[model samples]
Structure formats: structure tokens, C-alpha cells
Target chain A: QVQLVESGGGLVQAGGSLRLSCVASGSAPSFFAMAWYRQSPGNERELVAALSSLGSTNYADSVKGRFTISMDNAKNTVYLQMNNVNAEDTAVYYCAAGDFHSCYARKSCDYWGQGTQVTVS
Target chain B: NMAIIKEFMRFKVHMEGSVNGHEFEIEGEGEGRPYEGTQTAKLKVTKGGPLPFAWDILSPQFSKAYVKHPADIPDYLKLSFPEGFKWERVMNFEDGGVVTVTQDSSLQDGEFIYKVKLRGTNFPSDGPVMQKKTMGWEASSERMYPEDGALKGEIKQRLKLKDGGHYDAEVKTTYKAKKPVQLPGAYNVNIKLDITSHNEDYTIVEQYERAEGRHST
Candidate 1:
């Protein structure tokens, strides 16, 4: 069993870049598939990107160009990077890891990290 | 989603402090593993400042954590916070924390304005709920057709985002509860079946009553 934690919420000026972090506990970061989600307050949830333990990546069509999802196995942490953030990009960012042998190998997420609010002022 | 086991979590990391010269406002829902029977606390951390910091877990706001065993926390709990986090104080909740669910409906042009709350106040700081951006999951509406009752109101289920800044409830629904029914026979009993969202306990039985003081026998 692993736990996910989302952090790095702030007010990034429009056109700036923001990076959010999700740390995996109770297991190695490379043991599970990871996911990123973006949700502007009062808006629908959007899938940002997904990273597998095997080092593959998938991105949402809307943010495919700017959103980046990466992993740090040594630290058991995952990183979500975004550049050229706009007012529309100000939203809550969340990360999740799938349990090993369970769903979420670039698919459904069974475990989720708390969401961090990223405000693009 | 150990919805019921979360209620059994004897320890919690309360949030109302700051960390590392950074003012933080944190809140989140409790988490649970499939094999574990209790809720594992999880929270989203936010820092308020002009400079850039690496969102550390130990903050003045995070210093408000309350715990029973300071040394024996689960391994997964460590990942959520920073390296040097601790339970700072004992919360004065002589009254045990409880889960409360409520529903409200207002009519706007014959449509119902619906709202519901699934609040768990175990942690003095926030109600722990693991929610996503799209909270409208497992939402289905059905008219409560009784044994010949016309409760012809349309039921709609939609998961509401976290409150103003709290995870009091997982989500809210569009249906309405018709309030409590006042029972007769001089019992002064009022009972309302508080229906909740798609959680395990969908229908909560709540009773309200005032016992009349009787004279000396």
C-alpha cells in the first residue's frame, strides 16, 4: 500500500511556469504507474499526463504540448511541469499512483494524492 | 476507499500552522488501503508567499497535527509531509468527532437547487475526503416511489468540489429530502431519514426529540 501527496500550490503570474510535486510513500516510485490531473475551481477535471513504471508517457490532448510528467525513482517522487501558464491554467493539480498489479498502468488510477491549488494570478 | 474504516482512525494530522517561514493553508480527505481498515490521512498543501519554496510538509499550519502515537505512524504517511513534521498540540474536542450528512433543496423556476454535505470532523482542521475534479461519479437519480407516495421530485446526483476550502463532503446531490416527520401520540418525536450521497451508508437515520419533564410520580 502506497500513499500519494500533492503539493506546490502558488500564485504564478500569467505566462509563467509552475511545477507541482507528488511524492509516493510506502513503496518505490518506479513500482507504480503515475497520473496527473488539472482541475480549475468550479471546472471539470482534466487528465494531464500519465507515466508508467517502465518509463513511458501519455498526455492529454488539451495540454499535450506544455504539460510534462516525470518520475524520480531514487526519491520515490513524481513531478508535474507546466510552462507558459495562463489565467486558465490556474487550477488545482493532483497526482495519483496505481497500485502494483492493479489498474493504472497508463490507465485508471486507484490511489490519489491530495490536490494542490495552482493559482495563475 | 475505506469509507467506514476511516472513522476508526485514532490519529490525525491537524492543519492550522505554517512551516519554514512559509504560510501554508492545507486540507484534504482521509485515505485507506484495501487491506487496512482505517483511514490514512492525506492532504493538499498550499503555501502563501512571493518567493519560491519546495512545499515542505513541516509548516506552522501543518504543526497543528494531532496524533496518538507520534513514533509509530504508517510508512505511507511519511510521503505526504516533509521530514520534520510532528504533532504539536492536543485538540480540545471533549465531544468526539462525527460524520454529518445533510441535504437542501430550493426551487428556481420549478427546478431544484440541490446541496448536500458529507462532513467528517475528526480532525479539528479539515474533513478528510479524497476527491477528484470530476466528482460526479456513480450519480443516478430516481424518484423515491413509496408504497403509493407522490414524492414526485426529480433526484439528481452531482459531486460538488471541496467547499469554500474544506473537504466536508465528498460531493453533493441535486435531490431533496422532505425534512423530518413529527410523530404523534404525545411522544414529541421527530425523525428524518438523512440520505447521503453514494457512500456506503446511503441512508442515515437521524431522530430529533424533546422529552417532556414529568412531575414527581
Candidate 2:
């Protein structure tokens, strides 16, 4: 089974840029798509972005143009980048990899990282 | 996903500790062929202000009061505790030190409102259905008809300044059943208390009572 872990989350300036990285292990990271989810303080989990193996990306309506998800198949890693961060960006971010039901539609999440908390001050 | 195993489904994790400088490290290794490589990731320290405190029901008194007649069981099951029961703040802390917990006794008449859910079938059934189990590969015919209501209770909460700012509070709950309990078998009573302050700090806890035996007269 493949495992995922997210990192590089920390205190970022309100107007600065933030990038969180997620690495895959255990089975050479074979997956259809890797996605990012964030949960604000005392709130439910919300999808941020999903990056396909073919380098295409789909983001949630809340963060359509606010965040970017990029991937590198060679290194088996994914990154979530966001600029102009603010208090609303403070959340615990999680990375996941799972199956795709259709061309780019996600079916189910198979593996998820423990999550990394990010605070913007 | 392990709902197939009845015993395994009952397993739960109860974490009680300060997570101020806590780091969770994950490690794994495979036993199959060509999968023996071990991978490790050490999580960094969590940076935050005062971590919110948590509490749990400490050794709640579990007993079945005797009721000779099954019809009398409804009133007998009515929950009431004027004197109250003991609940402890399991753990608390922060980067600086212990933080005190103060309750606004004036609000809501100094009573904490809790939601109660009684889950079980009153009619004949094979087993108590606490929850329905569902899997894509398997089928289930479980039925869950839970009753929901509110309970008003007073917590003996006061100012405390001590180790980890822990408090042994007493909660007095009183409930009168508006709907009668028919054919008392087994029931799973879930009590949930959630209170949030203007400061965003909140206190939330849920307690479960599983009654599985017969009551004597």
C-alpha cells in the first residue's frame, strides 16, 4: 500500500507565499491523481486541489485561482502553493492519492497523510 | 472498513495528553517480496498558542435499577442526577504553561444543554444496532431508529488554578422522557455537550452508555 505525508507547513507572513510538499512511499507512488485538502480551525475538511498524473490540475471553487497544485512523477512528490496568504489561509493541510472513476473525476481516496498545520500571522 | 469484524469494530482510541511540542513520527515496512524497504517520516513540532483543553467521563457509574414491570421501565429509565456525577479534565497545557478554564455561570442559567440520542429498536430485533454497517462489497439489513432530545444539566464549574489547570467538575443531569420507552431491550445512549465561547475556545465531549442486561425488581 502506498503512503502519503505532507510537510513544509509553518508560520507564513500574511502577504507572503506558502508552499507545502507531499511525498509518496511504499509502492513507487502509482496513482491516478494526488489531491490536497485543508481544514480550517474547527471546521470540516474542504478540497483544495487535485493534480492528475498527466500534469493537469483541478481546484475547488473556493480556491480556484488562489492555490496551485503541481506534481513531479519522477520524484513521486506533489506540492501545494498559494500566494497572498491571510488569516483565512490558516488551516491543517492534508495530501492524498486515490483512484479516478472517469477521465479526471476522483472516485475514492486510498491513502492520506497525517496532515500538516499551517498558521498565517 | 473493519466493520466486518464485530470485536474489531468496537475498538476505539482515547488520546489524553498535551500536544504543545508533540511530534508524530510514522514508520512502515513491508513483508512481501521486493517490498522490504522501510520508510520513515518524522513530523516537526506543532507551533501554536494555547492548545485547547479536553475532558472525559471518569469511571461513570454503570448500574441497572430494578423494575419488576416492563411498563414501569420507561419512567425508571428517566435520567436524573440532582447531586451530579464526576467528570475530570483529562489533560491540558500550552507552550507557556497551564491555562485556567472559567465558565460563565450567568449564561443559559449556569446550565449546559446537552443533546441525547437513544439508539435501538423497540420491537423484536436480532441485535442492538448502534450504527449501520455498509461496504461496497457487502450488504447489510441493519435498522437504527434513534430518538433525539435535549437534556439540561448544571456543571459544578468554578475557577481553578492548579496543575495543568485540571478540574474535577460535577455534572448534574435531569431528563424526563416525553416519549415512553416500549419493550426495554438494549439501548445505546449517547450524550453530547458542546459549548463555545466568544474567544473561540470551546468544550465538547460525548459519553456513551450501553445497557446490555436485564433489570430486577
Candidate 3:
């Protein structure tokens, strides 16, 4: 019954930053990595970054400087922060678990969290 | 060879086998569009070799054949094995990692087997490696058919390759689920990947939604 549910503000002004949360239930904090993906309206999901081993984080090249991923082991949750967002960045976001390094070969996403839709107004 | 290629293009292949009386099954299905589309294939095999095998050419894309052998198995695949276990390359790819190849190997009988060997290179040695698995086949999506679902499946693997390596060594498996679920779109398939290593582990689950437009910009 491991599940990830994403929840956060759905609307934000252009140039405003946003924070999204991936809350986990029914799984140990150490069992998986927390990853965030962004999908612009009518587009596919793109990898944002991940938080593994609680505090460790990695970001994608395009957003590395503008985004951050952090975890609170005690709370069993991870957070995604995107600063200085733009309207073109509007999309539904998701947070889920799996190995980050294996993504290149396998390309299959196994476990997923119900996604949260967000928009940059 | 041409006939085999034609048949391979038209139908999917599934293989089942046994080693020293232990039984195993391996299945591969072509994914994506045919000819011009991307093909996604799946494999399910026992931990032991002389394994039974089968292929289902889920799409025409897989018809263009490629074979992989045990010797051709990448160092990443070999490194994923614990000591005392061995694998032999059965089929291989010639155009680098673009084509599909098959390999076989096994361990002692009675011990549980929990690995499927897939033939592909391009697997990342660093960062994240995306592994694909097969969920079982469902009724075709033809308008005349009552049941409409492609297949239900998942991918499992661990990435442990050093930097600059040609490819990473890893284990991946695809399976047919008991029941097929509705795909989000014509090409939407729910596939997931679980990645792990000594230092870290992460899971990525996504239902690939079909692309709506041709332009990427």
C-alpha cells in the first residue's frame, strides 16, 4: 500500500516561486527516493530532481540552479522548490519513488504518486 | 533469416525453459510504433539458464531483427550478478544498442530465481538508468474488440556503473499482470521502474501518454 500523494497551490503569478509537497504513507522513509516531475499542459512529464537518503538531492541541468529538493525523514515527506518561475512552466507535477541512476536504461517508471496539477498564472 | 525476421516482425516471441529440471520462462514483446516508431520490449526469465523463451512481436517495429548472446552481455549485466552465478550471451545487436538481442544463463535448481536478462546497451552507467518491463498482454485496442488494453507490466533494476563506461550493468524484468487496466491513450502504458544500489534507491512510475503533436519546441 505504498502511496505518494502530491499537494500544493495550483495557481501562481508569473515570475513567482512555488513549492510542492510529496507526502508518503505506508512505507518507511528509507525505502525509496523522492522524485519530482513537471509536465506542462498537454505535454509529457519531465524530471525535475530527487531527494534520496533523506537529505541528499539532485537536480536536472535546466533547473539545477533554480530548483531544490529536500526531505524531512521524520515527517516522511519531500519538498520541491522552484524559484522565479514563468508562465511557460505551468504544468501538473508528480512526486514518486525509484532509483535515479537506473532511469537511463530502463526508462520505465514503476511506482507512482497520484499527481498534483499546478499552473503559473 | 528473412523469414524469421518477417515472422519476428509480425508476431511476438516468448520462450520457456529449464536447467537441471528447474523451469523458467522468458517473454519479449515489441513496443512503440512499427518501422518508424520506437519499440519497447519485455523479458521474463528464471534465474537459471537453458531457460524457456518466447517473443511476441507486439508491434511491427521489432520485426527488424537483432540477436544478443551471453558473451555479448555487457559488463554491467555481468557485474550485477553475485558470485557463483554465470550467464552466456545467446543473441546480440550489431547496430550498437538500437537492436534487440537475447541472452540466457541460470543458477542451481531449487533456489529461487528473481532476474530477467534483457539485451540493450545505452543503459546509463551513471545517474539514472531507465529499465522497461512487460505487463501481460491484453486484448487489442481495435474498435471491433470489446476488451481494449495493451498489457500491464513493470520494470525492476539496479544501476551500478562507474563513470565513462560504455554502459551500465544491471538486471531488468517485465511481467504480464493478471488483469489489464485501461491505458490513458492509444499508446499510454503504465510502466514503472525501481532503482537501487548500495548508496541509494529510488522509484519512478509513469504512464506514458501518447504524444499529441510532432513538434518539440
Candidate 4:
């Protein structure tokens, strides 16, 4: 089990990009797998990225190209970076942690951080 | 609230005691639109020990994931003596998932070698909060009952938010066939999945609101 803290939010033009972070604590960074999300007010939760401790990832087909998910075990943080900020891209971003299995990936986000709101101009 | 909101999943497909087609059933596909993308899949089979094998999808446990709607995933059914006894294919499609099961049979190795290709995109979002989508995955389930027995089905499943970030998993599990047919009541499963994607990297471009193309810097 672990805790999560999501940050990195601001306004970007309809064609800009943003970088976000999900800081985790409690267990060793290696003890949990992290995933990122974009929650549009009414739009469903978009799974942006699922990152293992070692750095391998599975991205949602939507933000795959524009997003980069990374981990800093040294700092205990998970990063979510995305580009091409259009009106549809505006939403609250979040990152959570799941217990790590043999694959270094956790299937559920048992704990969530207060999301960072991204406003698109 | 479980004191928190969790929405990721990892599944353990157990080879419950073999079934005679009486235990499992496909009620129906959940509520969701058809997955309009091209969901290409691979079918793998193995011989000898679950180890030293390719694809490594044998045993009492295997790993799988869903980015869209969990209900879209498929649920498997039991098969009769695929060894000494021959059989026909089992076809099923519920919600937005599928199990285009062809077959992976051959008792010659004194072991069961089953490899079926499956896919589903019916995953709808759980919304601004945590998702409860626990797809039975029931996707393409091919079981070898002891002529009458269910594998002791118990395992771990890891699932997380689609977040469009990145994830790769390697899971291992072993289940004991509740009953026995030929070998001992034991099945081993090793799953290695690597999925890192991009926006324009989509197999189908029509599913999104934007045009298909990896944006330029």
C-alpha cells in the first residue's frame, strides 16, 4: 500500500503542452506501480499512462504520442507530461498507486492524490 | 469509500476444475457501444514445462488488462477431454469483448497446450472518480475439465487508471485443478505483457475526435 500526491498544472494554449507529477510515499517507490489519468468534468476518465517502477509503460492510445510518463524512485515521484493542449484536453489530472506484482505493474489505484486542474486557453 | 478510490486491475485467469459446459455461461455483453477500433490479437501455445516455453501462457494463472471498458473483456468456458477426446470450438461474445477461439490442442506432450487469440474495446470510462469495471475478462476461456472438476480458482489481478501514461506487467501464478484427469491437479501461469502507446500510434484512427497523426513539435 502507498500514498499519492498529484501536481504540475497550468494554462496552455489550444496547441501547447503541460507536464504533471504524482508524488508517492509510504512504501518503497518499487513497492508500487503508478498510473496517470485525465478526468474531464463530464467526459469519462481517460487512462493516460500506466508506469512500472523500472520505467516501462502502457499508454492510452489517446495521449500516447503527446504524453510521457516517468518515474523517479530516487525522489519517489511519477511524472505525466502531455502536449497539444486543445479545448478537449482540459481536465483534472491524477496519478495513483497499486501494490506491485511480479510485473512491476499494479492493477488498481487504491490511493489517489487530489488532482491538478489543467485549463486550456 | 474504501478510505480511498482505486481503479486499476490485473486479472488471474484460473483453470477452475474442468467443466462439462454446465458451470460457465455468457449472460450478455454489458451496456456500451461496439469497440470500433481494430483490436488485433495474438494466439500462443506451449509444450513441455510451462517454463522453457514460448508466450508462457500456461498454468493455473495468466495476466490480462483492459484500457477501455472492462465489461468488453471475455469470460471463458470449460472444455471436455481435448486430449483422448476430440471436440468443437466454443464461441462467445458478450458486451464488447470476444474470444475468437480457434484451438490449441494436443495431448501428445502429456501436457495441455491451449493458445487462443482474444480482444475487446468496450471499456467505458468510470468517470471523474474511481472505476468499478471488473471485466470477468471471461475473454476466450478455454478450459480442460477433469471430465468433471474446476481448477482451484484463486489469484491476484492488477488494474489501474487508463491515465494514458505507461505500464508493463509480468505476473506469475499457479493453480491446482480441483479434480484431476491425467496429470496432477496443478497448472502454472506466467504472463508477460508490455504495452506502451502513443496518440497517433493507434491501430484505428476513427475512434477519436482528433485526426490520426502523432503531433509535431
Candidate 5:
């Protein structure tokens, strides 16, 4: 079975930058896409972006200029970066995998990282 | 004697079935290879359908419609659109279709709607592609129109599709957010999915939460 593990800090200053990582094990890294989601106190989780291949990334309009996602195919790992953090950025972050091409309106998040809650001081 | 490197070609197939959470081997090679020496392949099968809780806005009437399957969405959403509007299957199993709508200048508002015309597909393994179209307008007025004032709409979708086969569908959506609105508290949004073969359909729903604002330095 393929597994996605995520790790990162839970606290940061309002103006500082935050970085997170998603590590994959037991499967080839290049075969699937990696995605990041953020869920605040009581709202629905939002898609930050999707990494189709190693080193390739796509961001949602709300976070387009502020967020960056990258991958290390050699190590089967993916990374997420958010700069110029603010109070609105506080939320629980999760890493997931999908069959990038599967058309189900909402593809199942087959594998997910143990979520990390981040707070902006 | 000189040693020569040799390459051996081998082909093997494994078949197994699971019923009611209990796993049983129907047939296949057993004990043929050692546990550590044998290569293992893992197959992750997901039943596709509609999101847990999603809605769509139809054309002409713009009526609010609920999706029973995710595969009912158009292909345009799954793969970026080429031009115009088209529905394509992103995945299909035996009974349903998963569709996507492409974003274009015409549908630039970021809202999408889908219409599912069911045909022959199986159940459980397959479903439809469904997504959010128009979230209900947040205006407090009892009466509202497209031009009365800023109209806010939020939608969510969840669905699945079967493997192979094709589906005919229509998707329309829009997105407009001049400014974010502050709510009294947080809200939970869910996407749902459903699949049908003949007249019977199965459904699934998934939930998500919006992120909160943090204090930035």
C-alpha cells in the first residue's frame, strides 16, 4: 500500500512564512499527484494546489501568488510553502494523493497525511 | 567456466475478492514464491459517485438541482477544456461516469454545473461526477435577482464514475467574490456522490471545513 506522511510546525508569527512536507513510502512517487488542503476552525477544506508530477505544481486562485508546492521525485517527497502569513492563514493542513486523471467529480483522498494544525500568533 | 548474465521473463496474474469486509482468495498462486522474494502489488479501488453534499444550477431556469452521482459531471471539469464546452469521462467503472468541466472565459466566474443523463452502468463500483454550481445568495433580502445587488453563491460536489463507456452531460457554473464575507461562526461543507445501474443507485458523501484567518506579524 502507498502511504503519504506529512510533517510541519504548528505555530508561526503572523508575518512569518510557513513550510510543510509530504513524504511518500511503499509506492512510486511519479505515478500520482500530490495535493494540499487547509481547513480553518469551522469551514470546509480548500484545495491549495495539485502537483501532477515531480517539480510541477498548480495553485488555486485564492492562494495563487502566495503558495508554492514542489516535489523531490528522487526521495518520493512533496513540499508546501506559504509566505507572508497572516491570521486568516491559520488552519489544519493535510497532504493527499489522487489519480489526477480520474473524473469522479470529487476523487477520493485515498491516502492522507496525519493532519497538522497551524496557528498564527 | 565463464559466467554469463541471463535475463528471465515471467508473467503472472493474481485475482482475489472481498465480500462484506471479509477477504477470501477465489483463486491464484499460493506459496509459489517466498513472502520476501515475491514482488507485491497493491490495488487501491475507490467507489466513485457524487460528493457528500453538493448542488448545481441548471441553465435557462437556473433551478437548484441536487446530484445523486459524481460521474454525471462533464469531462471539461476533469481535464482543462480545449474550447467551447464539452463533457468527458475522467473515469468509469461498470455503472457510472465521473465528469469534469473545463474553466474558460465564458465560465470564468469559477462556478460550475452539471447535468447527468443516466444510461447503462453498474452499481457500488461506479458513480457520477457532480460538483457545486451556485451557492445560495447570501443577501438578506427576501427577494433577490441577478442584478438586484451582489449575489453570492456557494456550491460543492462529490460523485464517481465507472470504468469505460461514455456519458452525455452538460455543466454550467460561475464564481463571483468581490470581497469575503464574515460569518458568525465556521461552517461545514460536504460533497456527495451516487451511482446507478438500471434504476438502483448508491451514494456517498464527504465533508470539509473552511480555513480560519490567522494573526500575521
Candidate 6:
């Protein structure tokens, strides 16, 4: 009863802003904290940010203060917003859920969305 | 005459249920390992038997979740014991690859060491075929007892896996409780075994691997 589909990512200019949303089906977006992972060109997968159950957002140190994660429980959607995009922001973004606690707890994602590619030129 | 040739060992659990009110049902689906495959079984545990746990297999590319049972990945195994708490030794196979080893419980003065082992398998390679590397990570578990006295169980979460799609991930948990009088009432223990992250975008070919550090440039 858990499924995720990602949207809103494509070519963008450097220093510009980008926002991607992951709409979840079969369950509410707030059932668990939602998280984002990305695979940059030539780099392996890495965690970008996570929205805590309490509405607090935690971003990886690499992207700290540059990326934001927010969720809309009413719409059953989770969003990942980026400010000042760059070559580092060029990657395939994926959203995931289905863990009792926050991503910091090491309880990995059980459900995920088909990733959206974000290319910063 | 071999579909593939590789150095590997198969680990299986042989559990025979007793007529003494104890029952265990094995559940599975799909194909390979417990994480990528499917399995199902009813464990009406009485004195003691196999513990139940589950994992979800994802599409190698998008990390899409695919599970056989509706209530598998989200549920933990519930083991109940009488006032005299019986010793239980049960193994669980969630999906088909992830193995919940054995739980040796001495209910008298409770102490349990629960272990889970994942079999080694190959994933589609995304980089140079000759590349080899070992990847591992840590995980945490939680247990709740009477009076909501929650106990935190730490796991030895490191495993070895080569870049060639052969690696073993084994997580072990330890819990200790004094006599039955120490924790009053029926002990319907809830054991939650938290698996490591599959959320990272590592390009799910055969298996996904990530390191703890600044993202590689």
C-alpha cells in the first residue's frame, strides 16, 4: 500500500532555483518522515535531506543551508527545494518513505519514487 | 551447464515446529534474496519458534518498492511468552534472502541475542566491471516492554561485500532483562530489526552501496 512518484526536475541555469515534488500513493505523506537521495553525475548515491515527523528539516552537511525539504500532508506530497543550483546539483533525485523514525536513525527507505533528473548547466 | 559460476555458500535454517501449541509458517514471494524476493509464513508462537520479519525488494533503477505481502515491511515480529517465559529458538526468512537468525531467550531472567543475516548476491554493475570495493554501514533497533520501558538495542552493523556483487550483511542484537518480577505481567515482546538505508541513489543494479562521508564529486 506504499508507492511514490517524483516530478519537476529538468534543465536549469547555474545559481537558479529548482523544486521537485514526490507524490505518494496508498498512504499519507506524513505517515513517516520523508527523505531525498541523489546520484550526481560520476558520483554514487548520497542523502540530500530529510523532513522529520515534527516538521523539522535535516540536510546533509554537503548541502546544508542550500537545500530544503518540506512536506504537504494534505496533498500527500513531499518537496525538495534547492537554492543556488550548480554543477553539484546535477543529479537524479529520488524521494523515499516508510520508516518509523527519522533517516538519522539508519532505518532506510522502504518505498521510493521513480527519480527525476536535474541538470544544471 | 551452469547459468553462472561464482564462489558462494548457501545458509539455511532448519526449524521443526512442535505440537506443543507452537506453529510457524514460512512466507516468501518473487525470486532472489529476502530483500529482493518474497516469502510468507504464519508463526503462532507458543513455547518458542521462528520469529517473523520482512524486507522489500526494489527495482534496480528507480528504487521502486516491490513486496509480496501487504503487511510485511512495516511490521515487526511479535513474540509472546507465558508468565514463566519460555526459551525460544526460531529463524525467519523475509522475502527469500534476508535471514533472521536465532533468538535464544531465557525468559526466567530474560536475555536475548537476536541475529539477522543477509545472503550475498550480485547486482547489475553500473561502473567499470573490474572495479572491486567493500561497503558496509550501521543500524539501530528498538524494543518495548511493560510500563513502556523502552530498551534500545545496538547492533554490530558492519559486513563485508566485494565489488563483484558478493557480500554478506549480518546484524546482531543483544537485550537483557532481570527476573519476571522485575518486569511485571505478560511479556509480549515487540522486536523491531531496522535494516540499513536502501533510499540512497546508488543505482540499484544488483545491490546498492553507499559510504559514510562527503558525497563523492
Q: Alpha carbon lDDT of residue B116, candidate 4?
A: 31
| lDDT of predicted model 1 | 0.40
Better of 2 and 3 by DockQ: 2
lDDT of 5 by residue, B1-217 (tens): 0011012111121222222121211111111111112211111111111112122111111111111112222112112211112221222222243322221111122222222222222223223323222222121111111222222223322122234333332222332222332111212212221111111111111111111111111
Question: Predicted candidate 5: what Cα RMSD to the true structure?
Answer: 27.1
Error of 5 at B102 (Å): 46
Evaluate model 2: give its lDDT.
Answer: 0.40
* lDDT scores of the candidates, listed in order: 0.40, 0.40, 0.39, 0.38, 0.38, 0.41
RMSD of 2: 22.3
DockQ of all predictions against the true structure, Cα-based: 0.03, 0.03, 0.01, 0.01, 0.01, 0.01
lDDT of 3 by residue, B1-217 (tens): 1211221222244443432232333443333332222233433221222121112111111121122112322212222222212222222211122213232322123111223333433322222222212222222211111122221211121122333322311222221112332222112222222211111011111111121111111
Q: Write the per-residue lDDT of candidate 1 for residues A1-121, one digit (tens) a residue.
A: 7888887667665544556788888754445788888787678887788887777788877777766788777877888777556677777788877843443453567788888888876
Question: A35-113 in candidate 3: lDDT tens per residue?
Answer: 7877876677888886665356667788776667877668777877665566766777778675444332233444677
Model 4 accuracy (lDDT, Cα): 0.38
The CAPRI quality class of candidate 3 comes to: incorrect
Off by over 4 Å in 1: A28-31, A99-107, B1-217
TM accuracy, model 1: 0.35
Off by over 4 Å in 2: A28-31, A102-104, B1-217
* i-RMS for every candidate: 11.5, 10.5, 21.7, 19.5, 16.0, 24.3
Interface DockQ of candidate 4: 0.01
- Sort every candidate by lDDT, greatest first: 6, 1, 2, 3, 5, 4
lDDT of 1 by residue, B15-80 (tens): 333222223233333322222222233333322222122121111111111122212222221222
C-alpha RMSD over true interface residues, model 5: 16.0
Worst 10 residues of 4 chain B by lDDT: B204-213
